[PDB]
Protein: Steroid 17-alpha-hydroxylase/17,20 lyase
Organism: Homo sapiens
Amino acid sequence: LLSLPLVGSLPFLPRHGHMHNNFFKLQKKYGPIYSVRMGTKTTVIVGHHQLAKEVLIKKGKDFSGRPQMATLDILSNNRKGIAFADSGAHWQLHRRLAMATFALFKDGDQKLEKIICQEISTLCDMLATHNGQSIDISFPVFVAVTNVISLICFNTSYKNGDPELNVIQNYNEGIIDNLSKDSLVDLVPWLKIFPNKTLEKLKSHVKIRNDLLNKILENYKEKFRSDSITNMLDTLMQAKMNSQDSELLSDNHILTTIGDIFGAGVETTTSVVKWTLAFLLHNPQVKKKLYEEIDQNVGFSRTPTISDRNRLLLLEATIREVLRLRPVAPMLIPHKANVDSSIGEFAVDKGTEVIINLWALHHNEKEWHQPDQFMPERFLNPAGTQLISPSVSYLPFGAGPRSCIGEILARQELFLIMAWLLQRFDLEVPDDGQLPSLEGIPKVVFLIDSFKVKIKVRQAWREAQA
Ligand code: HEM
Ligand SMILES: CC(=O)[C@H]1CC[C@H]2[C@@H]3CCC4=CC(=O)CC[C@]4(C)[C@H]3CC[C@]12C
């Protein structure tokens, strides 16, 4: 009796469980590195830190490419910008100019910390009006960090009530939902198989956003002067008139770059805040210690500041643990091999998509103790007097040529938002008992479901205004 001809095989069910976890589970069978092939395209999936650091760092320039996706073509305006641009002149030029801009905010009246604390103070104010109510803090936060990024890009911010923020949130939500059903890593290229309106939807959202950007671009071409270089949009225009590069800095090129900066800045950081609050509602004991800690080292004589990250250690560990358990990009962004190269002595041909399963790196049992648990203690020494790095299998922000450019902005924004929130507010479970689900919704960003927090102004903050 004969066996059936097999026209295709896949190692697990599509749309069943989270991709990053499904790949992780296969390592029991196949090893920390393996490949899958769809049609003519081969994809490799790496899930151990050693091989990862080889793809990211050691042979970084070999694997610094981005694969083309129908859905990303639209968002990045045909692989422009930074995040979704192939490695090349365009990419390298803009990446450095972006990174350069963060130097203009290292001191002065535009010290990044001052720009941040300003919008947080607007934030805490707004929230305080909801004293004794249960609310979704997504949009109050979205607004705060949008303002920070807008100040970095244009030296401007939005006024409270401005409906442009709403327009932005709508297309932000729409781009994310249509960018991919789930993770960016798709096994089967569904959208090319069945009739669907996925691309039409994404175009019409991204059109709105590109309109809004182009509008800002025009109403800044007049306000620009080489005598004043203070923000990201200045930096890009400075470098354009000095030009071989006149093509690499067209309108569409600066548009799309500002695009990635705006998106990355707001969505990643707002997601992580939410994940942070969510975890603390599940773990009161930790929350108590964070309250206890903040009262000892900052009290109520003043508002928190960067310099406090040197003493508010448990808060720092907490943020570190949230980024461990729930990475923003559980599988980073997909990489590509620019040349023929190797990983763990295995040949990898030019054009091969390479995927780093960061989920596997943060949940590896040999590297972490009880990795499935939320234990910020893991990032502190046994006394709790300094921070540690208990594993090298940890890469929230990536590494090497395509690593995160806004890590420093992000780490600060997060630290300040929580510290302020913790100083001023009692954050509790809403009256009907519902906690949020820490299962999460993997899209291009690892989101959490909407949820509510009952929010009260702490007595100790009130009884210290007299
Ligand atoms: C907690 C917050 C954040 C996390 C965990 C994070 C993490 C990451 C990761 C994993 C990547 C891709 C790594 C790779 O492809 O190898 C990335 C890329 C990038 N991130 Fe972030 N990020 C965060 C916040 C931000 C912020 C605040 C900005 C502000 C501008 C930003 C801008 C970018 C850009 C432009 C890239 C593309 C890099 C490239 O293609 O060369 N991100 N980030
Ligand atoms: C963490 C990360 O990789 C960042 C780098 C580029 C960022 C994205 C590119 C710009 C962008 C625009 C949007 O309208 C939704 C948010 C997105 C889709 C951004 C979400 C987070 C990304 C994917």
